[PDB]
Amino acid sequence: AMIDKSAVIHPSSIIEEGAVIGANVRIGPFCVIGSHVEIGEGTDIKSHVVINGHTRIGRDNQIYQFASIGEVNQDLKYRGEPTQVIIGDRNLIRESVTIHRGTTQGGNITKIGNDNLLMINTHVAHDCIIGDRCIIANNGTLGGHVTLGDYVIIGGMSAVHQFCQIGSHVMVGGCSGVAQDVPPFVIAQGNHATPYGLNIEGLKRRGFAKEDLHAIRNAYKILYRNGKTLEEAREEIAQLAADNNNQYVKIFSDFLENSAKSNRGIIR
Amino acid sequence: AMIDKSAVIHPSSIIEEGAVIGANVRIGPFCVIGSHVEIGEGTDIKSHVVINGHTRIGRDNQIYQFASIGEVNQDLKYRGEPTQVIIGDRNLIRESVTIHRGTTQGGNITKIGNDNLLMINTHVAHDCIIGDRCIIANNGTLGGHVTLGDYVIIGGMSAVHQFCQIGSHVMVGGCSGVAQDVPPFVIAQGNHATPYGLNIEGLKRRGFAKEDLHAIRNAYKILYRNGKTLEEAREEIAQLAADNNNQYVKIFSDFLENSAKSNRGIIR
Amino acid sequence: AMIDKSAVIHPSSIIEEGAVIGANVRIGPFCVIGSHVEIGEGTDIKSHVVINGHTRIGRDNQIYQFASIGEVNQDLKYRGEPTQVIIGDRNLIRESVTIHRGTTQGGNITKIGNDNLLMINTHVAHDCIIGDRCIIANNGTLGGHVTLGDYVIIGGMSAVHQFCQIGSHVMVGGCSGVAQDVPPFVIAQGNHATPYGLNIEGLKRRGFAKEDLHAIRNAYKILYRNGKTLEEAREEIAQLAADNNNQYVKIFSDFLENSAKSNRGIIR
Ligand SMILES: O=[P-]([O-])[O-]
């Protein structure tokens, strides 16, 4: 009925009545799909996969064996509310990845964008927000309410503490504990993680203009290397966004203005 | 015969003859339950769960997908003896948790008390002892013969080496390696882990009176921050428990006396 | 039919036409075995195991539940070529281990020898080579193209960066990140991992004579404890193996010469 006739579902799998399976979807054996799951066109699901909850999965995703998507979260305040997982298009979700449903107190939604790679045993906790083209290496873990920007790389066996915000194009080294906000374009390394410079080797593969590197490093220099306080290093970078009007300096500025709304602070 | 009438087992799951299944038990699809397994009343077991060995599971437990309970341990000295896993009541056992059976050389039993939370990918090795109301965050690992007191918190991606004793109300930070014994009420962080004062945030969360806090803190000053040796600190703390009859100073000295029977020592 | 008649396969498992299964093989329920898999005599495969790709498994292996062997690797330059996994005899492959197929760019093969122990959640990436009698503790991770000699120990929650070479009889401590090559017989620990003398307990457990220990201790001092550059020590170490003809100094020397053909260097 609600299963598209072009979908290929292995007979051994259990598809709960009410699940929406799009065109050209493939589902392997020994899967369990909940009655509120929606799976977009072209998505490929291997064997031994569990998908439940109010979960929306987009187009052309690949979900490998022993993955768990949309499951009850690990927050002790969750009370069975119809919270959601929302996954975009063309994501790679490897073996034993866990993506838990959100909480009402945290915004109701755990959200993942497009073109992401979640390696083996990646955990995405309740109410996380992952942008586009991110990579979380093996055993990576995001705490509750964690926000990732675009083109973020989380190294292997690294954890981001709850509520922390990771700016776009950040690289977190392997075996690193992130306990504060990480401004965009910077390398985070250590336990707890500290700024290790800019992600220059990564920004160059993205195709950044040479004099856009200098504008970004100026904001990094003002924030970390000029010996100024948070508010004073924030006034200067915000002034550069209006005088020189560099799109990356404004992004680097927008992050610090949003991090000022909370008592987390930034890594230093 | 041994399966209660009110239990609901999914027809795809495999239950060997001899498995004792209590009332109001729910077993999801694609499970394997061994012939020497006992499931207490009200326990909920999701899909894709493996439970074998001589395993006793109490009441109102929740065991999520891809968990393994009672399986052959990773000790090379084990030779197939009918050793046991014992799990208490109201435990939350999340995805991909492994709980292995004991060894005859270690005491024959891997034991877990009540009201514990074992997060995703938690490992409990052979002959471990876990008390009540403990929390092991994602990827936490207990080596063989490890003992956890009550209300212990092990941070994410942390490891307790074999035979080590973790006192009650201890908080182990994330990505920390515990190599020696941790006295009760203490925060331990690092690899190898070192003490960082009292777990004041946990104690005030559990309704500790202000007099009990200053009593425990004084016992901490005697142990670490007074220059007195381990033998001298044990003498004074034992004299405090006998004179003042404080229930938590007693727990503090008792741990030190039991740790004195071994050569590991305490963290410092 | 290439399934041997003495093999015992649970009817719920999916054995695709083309899989070759030797005599006395046992396969538990809910397994998926691909059409290009070969399984050798006496090998025990528990439940919920996925084995696919062009994968040859030797004799008397023990593969536990939720393991994945031969799956598409995480290298984003891979393009579905028929690459291989080769696993030797008498290996212990614990729960949720992942072993990925090779890449055409890196030698086409992921290879594992005999008598190895891969503990829970071990990851063996594409094109890795593991020798004999190695132990990888819980949550250990080998990046792409990593080589392990014989009798190697990787501590729990430790990661070996891609292309790095680990010499024989090395013990990598728990929660360590190996970013360069590790000469044989060396204890490596830290993040990044640095050398801390010889694996004396490992060598003595394997019956190393004291004359062998003194020669290895002597080769260690030349490389690390005499201020000699890499070119100097490598030439002097190669002179010791030619003169004294100590079989372990030669292994020590051969590793340094093979590592010199690359630019990763050695830990220090
Ligand atoms: O990096 P992991 O040992 O905390």
Coordinates of all heavy atoms in Angstrom, one line a residue, chain C residues 193-247:
Chain C
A193 N 51.7 8.7 20.3 CA 52.4 7.7 21.1 C 53.9 7.9 20.9 O 54.4 8.2 19.8 CB 52.1 6.3 20.6
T194 N 54.6 7.8 22.0 CA 56.1 7.9 22.1 C 56.7 6.7 22.7 O 56.0 5.9 23.4 CB 56.5 9.2 23.0 OG1 55.9 9.1 24.2 CG2 56.1 10.4 22.2
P195 N 57.9 6.3 22.5 CA 58.5 5.1 23.0 C 58.9 5.2 24.5 O 59.4 6.2 24.9 CB 59.7 4.9 22.1 CG 60.2 6.2 21.8 CD 58.9 7.1 21.6
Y196 N 58.7 4.1 25.2 CA 59.0 4.0 26.6 C 59.8 2.7 26.9 O 59.4 1.9 27.8 CB 57.8 4.1 27.5 CG 57.1 5.4 27.5 CD1 56.3 5.9 26.5 CD2 57.4 6.3 28.6 CE1 55.8 7.2 26.6 CE2 56.8 7.5 28.7 CZ 56.0 8.0 27.7 OH 55.4 9.2 27.7
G197 N 60.8 2.4 26.2 CA 61.6 1.2 26.5 C 61.1 0.0 25.8 O 60.3 0.1 24.8
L198 N 61.6 -1.1 26.2 CA 61.3 -2.4 25.6 C 60.1 -3.1 26.3 O 59.8 -2.8 27.5 CB 62.5 -3.4 25.7 CG 63.8 -3.0 25.0 CD1 64.7 -4.2 25.0 CD2 63.5 -2.6 23.5
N199 N 59.4 -3.9 25.5 CA 58.3 -4.7 26.0 C 58.8 -5.9 26.8 O 58.7 -7.1 26.3 CB 57.3 -5.1 24.9 CG 56.1 -5.9 25.3 OD1 55.8 -5.9 26.5 ND2 55.5 -6.6 24.4
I200 N 59.4 -5.6 27.9 CA 60.2 -6.6 28.6 C 59.3 -7.8 29.1 O 59.7 -9.0 29.0 CB 61.0 -6.0 29.8 CG1 61.7 -7.1 30.6 CG2 60.0 -5.2 30.7 CD1 62.8 -7.8 29.8
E201 N 58.1 -7.5 29.6 CA 57.2 -8.5 30.0 C 56.7 -9.4 28.9 O 56.6 -10.6 29.0 CB 56.0 -7.9 30.8 CG 55.9 -8.3 32.2 CD 55.9 -7.1 33.2 OE1 54.8 -6.5 33.4 OE2 57.0 -6.7 33.7
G202 N 56.5 -8.8 27.7 CA 56.1 -9.6 26.6 C 57.2 -10.5 26.1 O 57.0 -11.7 25.8
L203 N 58.4 -10.0 26.0 CA 59.6 -10.8 25.5 C 59.9 -12.0 26.5 O 60.1 -13.1 26.0 CB 60.8 -9.9 25.4 CG 60.7 -8.7 24.4 CD1 62.0 -8.1 24.1 CD2 60.1 -9.2 23.1
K204 N 59.8 -11.7 27.8 CA 60.1 -12.8 28.7 C 59.0 -13.8 28.8 O 59.2 -15.0 29.0 CB 60.3 -12.2 30.1 CG 61.6 -11.3 30.2 CD 62.2 -11.4 31.6 CE 61.7 -10.2 32.5 NZ 62.5 -10.1 33.7
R205 N 57.7 -13.4 28.5 CA 56.6 -14.4 28.5 C 56.8 -15.3 27.3 O 56.4 -16.5 27.4 CB 55.3 -13.6 28.4 CG 54.1 -14.5 28.3 CD 52.8 -13.8 28.8 NE 52.8 -12.4 28.6 CZ 52.4 -11.8 27.5 NH1 51.9 -12.5 26.5 NH2 52.5 -10.5 27.4
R206 N 57.3 -14.8 26.2 CA 57.6 -15.6 25.0 C 59.0 -16.3 25.1 O 59.4 -16.8 24.1 CB 57.5 -14.8 23.8 CG 56.0 -14.3 23.5 CD 56.0 -12.9 23.0 NE 54.7 -12.3 23.3 CZ 54.4 -11.0 23.1 NH1 55.4 -10.1 22.8 NH2 53.2 -10.5 23.4
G207 N 59.6 -16.3 26.3 CA 60.8 -17.1 26.4 C 62.1 -16.5 25.9 O 63.0 -17.2 25.5
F208 N 62.2 -15.1 25.8 CA 63.4 -14.5 25.3 C 64.5 -14.6 26.3 O 64.4 -14.3 27.4 CB 63.1 -13.0 25.0 CG 62.5 -12.8 23.6 CD1 61.4 -13.5 23.2 CD2 63.0 -11.8 22.7 CE1 60.8 -13.2 22.0 CE2 62.5 -11.6 21.5 CZ 61.3 -12.3 21.1
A209 N 65.7 -15.1 25.8 CA 66.8 -15.3 26.7 C 67.4 -13.9 27.0 O 67.1 -12.9 26.4 CB 67.9 -16.1 26.0
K210 N 68.2 -13.9 28.1 CA 68.7 -12.6 28.6 C 69.8 -12.1 27.7 O 70.0 -10.9 27.6 CB 69.3 -12.8 30.0 CG 68.2 -12.9 31.1 CD 68.8 -13.2 32.5 CE 69.9 -12.1 32.9 NZ 70.5 -12.4 34.2
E211 N 70.5 -13.0 27.0 CA 71.5 -12.5 26.0 C 70.7 -11.8 24.8 O 71.3 -10.8 24.2 CB 72.3 -13.6 25.4 CG 71.6 -14.7 24.7 CD 71.3 -15.9 25.5 OE1 71.2 -15.8 26.7 OE2 71.2 -17.0 24.9
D212 N 69.5 -12.2 24.5 CA 68.7 -11.6 23.5 C 68.2 -10.2 24.0 O 68.1 -9.2 23.3 CB 67.5 -12.5 23.1 CG 68.0 -13.8 22.5 OD1 69.0 -13.8 21.7 OD2 67.4 -14.8 22.7
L213 N 67.8 -10.2 25.3 CA 67.3 -8.9 25.9 C 68.4 -7.8 25.9 O 68.1 -6.7 25.6 CB 66.8 -9.1 27.3 CG 65.6 -10.1 27.4 CD1 65.3 -10.4 28.9 CD2 64.3 -9.5 26.8
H214 N 69.6 -8.2 26.2 CA 70.7 -7.3 26.3 C 71.0 -6.7 24.9 O 71.3 -5.5 24.7 CB 72.0 -7.9 26.9 CG 73.1 -7.0 27.0 ND1 74.0 -6.7 26.0 CD2 73.5 -6.2 28.1 CE1 74.9 -5.9 26.4 NE2 74.6 -5.5 27.7
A215 N 70.9 -7.5 23.8 CA 71.2 -7.1 22.5 C 70.1 -6.1 22.0 O 70.4 -5.1 21.4 CB 71.3 -8.2 21.5
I216 N 68.8 -6.4 22.3 CA 67.7 -5.5 22.0 C 67.8 -4.2 22.7 O 67.6 -3.2 22.2 CB 66.4 -6.3 22.1 CG1 66.4 -7.6 21.3 CG2 65.3 -5.4 21.7 CD1 65.1 -8.4 21.5
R217 N 68.1 -4.3 24.0 CA 68.3 -3.1 24.8 C 69.4 -2.3 24.3 O 69.4 -1.0 24.3 CB 68.6 -3.5 26.3 CG 67.4 -3.3 27.3 CD 67.2 -1.9 27.7 NE 66.0 -1.7 28.6 CZ 64.9 -1.1 28.2 NH1 64.8 -0.6 27.0 NH2 63.9 -1.0 29.0
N218 N 70.5 -2.9 23.7 CA 71.6 -2.2 23.2 C 71.2 -1.5 21.8 O 71.6 -0.3 21.6 CB 72.8 -3.1 22.9 CG 74.0 -2.4 22.4 OD1 74.3 -2.5 21.2 ND2 74.7 -1.6 23.2
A219 N 70.4 -2.2 21.0 CA 69.9 -1.6 19.8 C 69.0 -0.4 20.0 O 68.8 0.5 19.2 CB 69.3 -2.6 18.9
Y220 N 68.2 -0.5 21.2 CA 67.3 0.6 21.5 C 68.1 1.8 21.9 O 67.6 2.9 21.6 CB 66.4 0.1 22.7 CG 65.4 1.1 23.1 CD1 64.1 1.0 22.6 CD2 65.6 2.0 24.1 CE1 63.1 1.9 23.0 CE2 64.7 2.9 24.5 CZ 63.4 2.9 23.9 OH 62.5 3.8 24.3
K221 N 69.2 1.7 22.6 CA 69.9 2.9 23.1 C 70.5 3.6 21.9 O 70.5 4.9 21.9 CB 71.1 2.4 24.0 CG 70.6 2.0 25.4 CD 71.8 1.6 26.3 CE 71.3 1.1 27.6 NZ 72.5 0.7 28.5
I222 N 71.0 2.9 20.9 CA 71.6 3.6 19.7 C 70.5 4.4 18.9 O 70.8 5.5 18.5 CB 72.2 2.5 18.8 CG1 73.3 1.7 19.6 CG2 72.9 3.2 17.6 CD1 74.0 0.6 18.8
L223 N 69.3 3.8 18.8 CA 68.3 4.5 18.1 C 67.7 5.7 18.8 O 67.3 6.7 18.2 CB 67.2 3.6 17.7 CG 66.0 4.1 16.8 CD1 66.5 4.4 15.4 CD2 64.9 3.1 16.8
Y224 N 67.7 5.7 20.2 CA 66.9 6.6 21.0 C 67.7 7.4 22.0 O 67.4 8.5 22.3 CB 65.7 5.9 21.7 CG 64.6 5.6 20.7 CD1 64.0 4.3 20.8 CD2 64.1 6.6 19.9 CE1 62.9 4.0 19.9 CE2 63.0 6.3 19.0 CZ 62.4 5.0 19.1 OH 61.4 4.7 18.2
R225 N 68.7 6.7 22.6 CA 69.3 7.3 23.9 C 70.8 7.7 23.6 O 71.6 7.7 24.6 CB 69.2 6.2 25.0 CG 69.0 6.9 26.4 CD 69.4 5.9 27.5 NE 68.9 6.3 28.8 CZ 69.5 7.3 29.5 NH1 70.6 7.9 29.1 NH2 69.0 7.6 30.7
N226 N 71.1 8.1 22.4 CA 72.5 8.5 22.2 C 72.6 9.7 21.3 O 73.7 10.0 20.8 CB 73.3 7.3 21.5 CG 73.7 6.3 22.5 OD1 73.4 5.1 22.3 ND2 74.3 6.7 23.6
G227 N 71.5 10.4 21.1 CA 71.6 11.7 20.3 C 71.9 11.5 18.8 O 72.2 12.5 18.1
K228 N 72.0 10.2 18.3 CA 72.3 10.0 16.9 C 71.1 10.2 16.1 O 70.0 9.8 16.4 CB 72.9 8.6 16.8 CG 73.9 8.1 17.8 CD 75.3 8.1 17.2 CE 76.3 7.7 18.2 NZ 76.0 6.4 18.9
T229 N 71.3 10.8 14.9 CA 70.2 11.0 14.0 C 69.8 9.7 13.4 O 70.4 8.6 13.6 CB 70.7 12.0 12.8 OG1 71.8 11.4 12.1 CG2 71.0 13.3 13.4
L230 N 68.6 9.7 12.7 CA 68.1 8.5 12.1 C 69.0 7.8 11.1 O 69.2 6.6 11.1 CB 66.7 8.8 11.4 CG 65.5 8.0 11.9 CD1 64.3 8.2 11.0 CD2 65.9 6.5 12.0
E231 N 69.6 8.6 10.3 CA 70.6 8.1 9.3 C 71.8 7.4 10.0 O 72.2 6.3 9.6 CB 71.1 9.1 8.3 CG 72.2 8.7 7.4 CD 73.3 9.8 7.2 OE1 73.0 10.9 7.7 OE2 74.3 9.4 6.7
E232 N 72.3 8.1 11.1 CA 73.4 7.5 11.8 C 73.1 6.2 12.5 O 73.8 5.2 12.3 CB 73.9 8.5 12.8 CG 74.5 9.8 12.2 CD 75.0 10.7 13.3 OE1 75.9 10.3 14.0 OE2 74.5 11.9 13.4
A233 N 72.0 6.2 13.3 CA 71.6 5.0 14.0 C 71.3 3.9 13.1 O 71.7 2.7 13.4 CB 70.5 5.3 15.0
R234 N 70.5 4.1 12.0 CA 70.2 3.1 11.1 C 71.4 2.4 10.5 O 71.4 1.2 10.2 CB 69.2 3.6 10.1 CG 68.7 2.6 9.1 CD 67.4 3.1 8.5 NE 67.3 4.5 8.4 CZ 67.7 5.2 7.4 NH1 68.3 4.6 6.3 NH2 67.6 6.6 7.4
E235 N 72.4 3.2 10.2 CA 73.6 2.6 9.7 C 74.4 1.8 10.8 O 75.0 0.7 10.5 CB 74.5 3.6 9.1 CG 74.0 4.3 7.9 CD 74.9 5.5 7.4 OE1 76.0 5.6 7.8 OE2 74.4 6.3 6.6
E236 N 74.3 2.3 12.0 CA 75.0 1.6 13.1 C 74.3 0.3 13.5 O 74.9 -0.7 13.8 CB 75.2 2.5 14.3 CG 76.0 1.9 15.4 CD 76.3 2.8 16.6 OE1 75.9 4.0 16.4 OE2 76.9 2.4 17.6
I237 N 72.9 0.4 13.5 CA 72.1 -0.8 13.9 C 72.4 -1.9 12.8 O 72.5 -3.1 13.1 CB 70.6 -0.4 14.0 CG1 70.4 0.5 15.1 CG2 69.8 -1.7 14.1 CD1 70.6 -0.1 16.5
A238 N 72.4 -1.5 11.5 CA 72.7 -2.5 10.5 C 74.0 -3.1 10.6 O 74.2 -4.2 10.1 CB 72.5 -1.8 9.1
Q239 N 75.0 -2.4 11.2 CA 76.3 -3.0 11.4 C 76.3 -4.0 12.6 O 77.1 -5.0 12.6 CB 77.3 -1.9 11.7 CG 78.2 -1.4 10.5 CD 79.1 -0.3 10.8 OE1 78.6 0.9 10.8 NE2 80.3 -0.5 11.1
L240 N 75.4 -3.8 13.6 CA 75.3 -4.7 14.7 C 74.7 -6.1 14.2 O 75.2 -7.1 14.6 CB 74.5 -4.1 15.8 CG 74.8 -4.5 17.3 CD1 73.8 -3.8 18.2 CD2 74.7 -6.0 17.5
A241 N 73.7 -6.0 13.3 CA 73.1 -7.2 12.9 C 74.0 -8.0 12.0 O 74.0 -9.3 11.9 CB 71.8 -6.9 12.1
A242 N 74.9 -7.3 11.2 CA 75.9 -8.0 10.4 C 77.0 -8.6 11.3 O 77.5 -9.7 10.9 CB 76.5 -7.1 9.4
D243 N 77.4 -8.0 12.3 CA 78.5 -8.4 13.2 C 78.1 -9.5 14.1 O 78.4 -10.7 14.0 CB 79.1 -7.3 13.9 CG 79.8 -6.3 13.0 OD1 80.2 -6.7 11.9 OD2 80.0 -5.1 13.4
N244 N 77.3 -9.2 15.1 CA 76.9 -10.1 16.2 C 75.9 -11.2 15.7 O 75.8 -12.2 16.4 CB 76.3 -9.4 17.4 CG 77.4 -8.6 18.2 OD1 78.5 -8.5 17.7 ND2 77.0 -8.1 19.3
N245 N 75.2 -10.9 14.6 CA 74.2 -11.9 14.1 C 73.2 -12.3 15.1 O 72.8 -13.4 15.2 CB 74.9 -13.1 13.5 CG 75.1 -13.1 12.0 OD1 76.2 -13.0 11.5 ND2 74.0 -13.1 11.3
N246 N 72.7 -11.3 15.9 CA 71.6 -11.5 16.7 C 70.3 -11.5 15.9 O 70.0 -10.5 15.2 CB 71.5 -10.5 17.8 CG 70.4 -10.7 18.9 OD1 69.3 -10.4 18.6 ND2 70.8 -11.3 20.0
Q247 N 69.5 -12.6 16.0 CA 68.3 -12.7 15.1 C 67.3 -11.6 15.4 O 66.5 -11.2 14.5 CB 67.6 -14.0 15.3 CG 67.0 -14.2 16.7 CD 66.3 -15.5 16.9 OE1 66.8 -16.5 17.3 NE2 65.0 -15.5 16.5

